[PDB]
């Protein structure tokens, strides 16, 4: 009966922000709590209680939603696979590489950290071109690196004797599955400064700079369980929620517009991080009427 | 007691560096360079630890600071891979692990003005500016001792804004307060050891923010010198020497 | 078997529900966790890092010349150097800061700010400046006698080449919305102006113009709430 004590502590306790102490005036020499040296590389140690006369505030504002868990544990689109079986693509299946860097919202949040180590939850929202969800049966097979990749809707790899597969219909709640940390290294790496293989990297197209196979986690194979062309195209949307996050080496957030997945390539028309004023003195605030 | 002295002496190996106008010494991420503990090791071969031969100060490059100067960047293991007994233990072994103590030197008269930003960026992936043509050349990714002049320092040639580079371990060489920057950086990687030829752990960046201004009659040639020193260098996986 | 009754909210995919899904790999033990330096567990720890403010974001100023507040020897007295607003999530100088980009991932902020100034001039250049924080209600001060009435520091150049202006938390409400403009100027923070308390004096054979580097950050009592998406970067097609 020691779990009743554990079940009570299963709530988000509030951790409050810092308090302010009351301050008085200081008229003396040799005590300069406002002069700093930014060349040191350290941020300013100056506090409010030493620059102005402050009051006592008992701050009760919470700081929990600023954790890296809460900031990241939120689903987001990481892929859109289109299973085509109509027109000039009578395939019935798609093999999609697992890359979470194809959509700007999840990408910019992840590229805040250099190394991340997390478990994940993957939800699949599949439908047709008109938002409709008939009772078509679909198989969502996961093909780890080295496993054989399907070549038709009716090929032996769909037997999923060892690969994880999920059978679901479009007319059912979105399939959801917990994925562990699956990298040979001890953490994923959104920025790899190097090359995968040794050699003289004197090629015209240096397509291998930055590619770390520790993040290449394989393919997702999706088929309609059918025996011929269904004539209907199915869109699948992959949402990745990050759980048990550990992040290292913060980085500047992206300022330029992305151009290509897997590369930090930007454009020659460099945009400005800040918008433009008319002068270094103009501010956009027309307050009250001055008394004088 | 609670201040930072301006005189500093940095002695590792058979090298000593003196400075009389130092600001402080940045201990990146609060951690000192260390050897690989057995709890966090994967290779079974006994590592080589050349203590005084490898861990020492190497003066490697001097760049001429000018008014119209963008900046320069070096990649850390690449800058020292053809020099001394470091550039031989790193060519004979497949695995390598080391920190460093970067020291940047720029002195000028009290009638000169200007400020440099010296930062150490883990996993500094250089991007290309597209109108091949979409990927950087090997000269711009691993430039060696003679580093690479920046093309767009505003974006650090990586798409990231320069204003936020202060999130990395950094220092300033402001020509009215100091003339050297010192950054001690531990080994940062998602793997205990890694190749010193195919992977650059850190990027060393020196960018002028406030350009170098002087008056007529002053010394027009103000050089910036980069001195680096490995700390706690280990090597494993001996084989034929490879230079890539 | 056991009688149950389904309730509303069944079959819904709430993108922020901390639930439990089935594991796709039974018996999986991942790679061991080794010590990587530089672990950060809170975004507020990043907001307290000083980053460069883009105060010279005027039209025609390109590149790193936007991170520089020009300071110069003056012919007249009591003149204005530069101004900017202290709303962290407003289009302006605070877009270049880490506290200004983390703020845009949240809806409301609270706590004191910190704008550290650094004088990158000659050793022989002396001067004194009056940096003033004008609380909400008033427009940008038209004179130094008006700005003097607010939270201000006088800054003497010297050996220690940096000064810290703590923008204190003077607010009607416990929180301010990151959005600003229109009705949301109810949450305006104020205006920081830099005046010349004295002149910028230099000896002969010394440059008469220098720069000031602004470094904005957050204090120990900074907080954020109502996590949201950002208006920073856009996309029109999948990167492929």
């Amino acid at each position, epitope marked *: 009966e020691s779990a009743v004590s554990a079940l009570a502590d299963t709530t988000i306790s509030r951790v409050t922000a810092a308090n302010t102490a009351a301050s008085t005036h200081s008229l003396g020499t040799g005590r300069v709590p406002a002069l700093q040296a930014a060349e040191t590389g350290a941020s300013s140690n100056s506090s409010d209680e030493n620059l102005i006369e402050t009051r006592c505030v008992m701050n009760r504002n919470g700081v929990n939603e600023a954790s890296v868990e809460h900031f990241y544990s939120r689903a987001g689109l990481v892929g859109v696979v289109e299973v085509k079986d109509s027109g000039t693509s009578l395939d019935g299946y798609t093999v999609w590489p697992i890359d979470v860097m194809g959509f700007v919202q999840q990408r910019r949040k992840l590229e805040l950290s250099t190394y991340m180590r997390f478990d994940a939850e993957f939800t699949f929202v599949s439908n047709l071109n008109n938002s409709t969800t008939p009772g078509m049966l679909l198989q969502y097979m996961y093909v780890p690196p080295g496993a054989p990749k399907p070549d038709s809707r009716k090929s032996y790899q769909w037997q999923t004797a060892t690969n994880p597969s999920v059978f679901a219909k479009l007319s059912d709640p979105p399939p959801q599955v917990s994925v562990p940390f699956m990298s040979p290294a001890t953490a994923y790496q959104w920025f790899y400064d190097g090359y995968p293989t040794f050699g003289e990297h004197k090629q015209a197209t240096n397509l291998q700079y930055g590619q770390c196979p520790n993040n290449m986690m394989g393919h997702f194979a999706i088929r309609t369980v059918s025996e011929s062309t269904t004539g209907k195209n199915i869109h699948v949307r992959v949402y990745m929620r990050i759980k048990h996050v550990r992040a290292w080496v913060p980085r500047p957030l992206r300022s330029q517009a992305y151009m290509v997945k897997n590369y930090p390539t930007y454009s020659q028309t460099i945009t400005n991080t800040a918008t*433009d004023r008319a002068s270094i003195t103009t501010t956009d605030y027309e307050g009250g009427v001055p008394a004088s | 007691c609670g201040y930072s002295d301006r005189v500093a002496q940095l002695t590792v190996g058979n090298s000593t560096i003196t400075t009389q106008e130092a600001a402080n010494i940045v201990l990146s991420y609060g951690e000192w360079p260390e050897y690989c503990p057995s709890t966090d090791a994967t290779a079974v071969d006994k590592p080589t630890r050349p203590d005084v031969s490898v861990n020492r100060f190497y003066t490697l490059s001097t760049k001429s600071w000018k008014t119209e100067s963008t900046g320069w960047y070096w990649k850390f293991p690449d800058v020292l891979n053809d020099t001394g007994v470091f550039g031989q233990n790193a060519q004979f072994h497949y695995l390598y692990r080391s920190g460093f103590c970067m020291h940047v030197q720029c002195n000028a008269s009290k009638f000169h003005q200007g400020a440099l930003l010296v930062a150490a960026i883990p996993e500094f992936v250089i991007a290309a500016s597209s109108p091949q043509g979409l990927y950087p050349d090997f000269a711009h990714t691993n430039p060696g001792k003679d580093g690479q002049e920046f093309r767009d320092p505003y974006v650090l040639d990586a798409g990231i804004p320069l204003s936020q580079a202060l999130i990395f371990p950094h220092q300033w060489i402001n020509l009215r307060t100091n003339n050297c920057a010192t950054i001690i950086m531990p080994y940062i990687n998602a793997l205990p050891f890694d190749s010193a030829l195919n992977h650059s752990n850190f990027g060393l960046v020196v960018i002028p923010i406030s*350009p170098l201004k002087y008056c007529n009659g002053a010394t027009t040639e103000v050089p910036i010198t980069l001195t680096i020193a490995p700390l706690n260098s280990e090597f494993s996986g001996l084989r034929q020497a490879i230079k890539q | 078997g056991f009688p149950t009754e389904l309730k509303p909210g069944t079959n819904q995919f709430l993108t922020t529900d901390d639930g439990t899904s089935p594991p796709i790999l039974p018996g999986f033990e991942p790679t061991p966790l080794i010590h990587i330096p530089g672990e950060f567990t809170s975004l507020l720890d990043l907001c307290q890092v000083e980053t460069i403010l883009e105060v010279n974001n005027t039209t*025609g100023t390109t590149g*790193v*010349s936007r991170l520089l507040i*020009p300071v110069r020897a003056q012919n007249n007295v009591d003149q204005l150097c530069a101004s900017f607003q202290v709303d962290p999530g407003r289009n302006g100088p605070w877009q270049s800061t880490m506290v200004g980009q983390i703020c845009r991932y949240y809806t409301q902020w609270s706590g004191s700010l910190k704008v550290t100034f650094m004088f990158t001039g000659s050793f022989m250049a002396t001067g004194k400046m009056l940096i003033a924080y004008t609380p909400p209600g008033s427009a940008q001060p038209t004179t130094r006698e008006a700005a003097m009435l607010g939270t201000h520091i006088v800054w003497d150049f010297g050996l220690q080449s940096s000064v810290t202006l703590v923008i204190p938390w003077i607010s009607n409400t416990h929180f301010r919305a990151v959005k600003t403009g229109g009705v949301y100027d109810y949450y305006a923070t104020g205006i920081v102006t830099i005046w010349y308390q004295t002149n910028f004096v230099v000896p002969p054979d010394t440059p008469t*113009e220098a720069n000031i580097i602004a470094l904005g950050a957050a204090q120990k009592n900074f907080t954020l709430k109502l996590c949201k998406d950002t208006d920073e970067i856009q996309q029109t097609a999948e990167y492929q």
Partner: antibody
Amino acid sequence: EVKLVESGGGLVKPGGSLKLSCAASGFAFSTYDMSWVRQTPEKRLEWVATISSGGSYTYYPDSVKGRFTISRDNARNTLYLQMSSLRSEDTALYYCARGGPYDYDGSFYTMDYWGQGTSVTVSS
Amino acid sequence: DIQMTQSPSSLSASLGERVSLTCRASQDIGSRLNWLQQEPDGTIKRLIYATSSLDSGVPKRFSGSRSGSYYSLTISSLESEDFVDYYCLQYAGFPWTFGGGTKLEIK
């Protein structure tokens, strides 16, 4: 005192070449961006060239881009303008002035101290 | 190219009056409009820079301002050596363009 002395004018035949130097004195020539300016006989000024304070960066308007080249000698404190195949549309008075878009501390000396004015004439 | 248009090509006055010369821009140029003065011999000197700052050594009779897209240079009290020529230079775009002269004469 800042003094710029341009020299090298003359009457060059159509489709030729001409070099226009500009002796600088009284200031640190290695810290300022310089630029050349034209003045059509119609009393209409025009930008022709600009160069960085070190000589790496150059910008030419489309009316001049491809023909003229602007050099810089900092040890001798001289500024050059090497012309190429010319036309009657280039007969004007050329001025050497300070200013350039390749300086982070610019925008203050932009066209602050002009020269005296040479005179080129393209005709037969 | 940012075409800049000076409104008066010529303005007559008498010693002591107050004249003003405007110069409008085709796009946003900010506080990057300068003013020049060409003497009869052919020397150019910069009077006002950034539309509101007078060059060190210029009389207090010159005053620059901005009212919308119109950038104006005002001569409060005209003296004798103020009847030569005036140009506006913009340096916000890359093709730095100049005005078209505002030669002031006497009556």
